[PDB]
């Protein structure tokens, strides 16, 4: 609905705030995974025996 979006524009930057917060959470999760698992810069391998 275009008319709904036009009425939604009167409320300001609520949509931008919600998108920014979700984007921050989304990058935060990847940062969490990097912090926990990507703690070595060398990929070590076990000997064949």
């Amino acid at each position: 609905s275009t008319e709904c979006s036009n009425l939604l524009l009167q409320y300001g930057s609520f949509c931008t705030q919600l998108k920014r917060a979700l984007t921050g959470i989304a990058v935060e999760q990847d940062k969490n995974t990097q912090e926990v698992f990507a703690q070595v810069k060398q990929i070590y391998k076990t000997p064949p025996i």
Binding site: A26, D30, F37, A38, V40, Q42, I43, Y44, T46, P47
Partner: protein
């Protein structure tokens, strides 16, 4: 059709940057470092050490002499293998 409806309502799930296989690869690298090099790889270059000598170093860390580990090496290895098997059985047999 829960996922389809959630997608269709303007909510989109974004894939993790690290895929499960790469996270598994990172865990494999950490396991290879801690097994072949002990704690050396975490503090600098990976220095190879035999695993019984590494376990003896860890025994010294908790205040037990090296001889206790070396004399009872087969018993300690059997206990560790049994414990790992018990861990796999416990995870497979418990829903919670």
């Amino acid at each position: 059709d829960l996922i389809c409806a959630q997608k269709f309502n303007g909510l989109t799930v974004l894939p993790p940057l690290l895929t499960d296989e790469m996270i598994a690869q990172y865990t494999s690298a950490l396991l290879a470092g801690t097994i072949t090099s002990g704690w050396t790889f975490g503090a600098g270059p990976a220095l190879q050490i035999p695993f019984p000598m590494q376990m003896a170093y860890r025994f010294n860390g908790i205040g037990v002499t090296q001889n206790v580990l070396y004399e009872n090496q087969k018993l300690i290895a059997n206990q560790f293998n049994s414990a790992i098997g018990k861990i796999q059985d416990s995870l497979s047999s418990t829903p919670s």
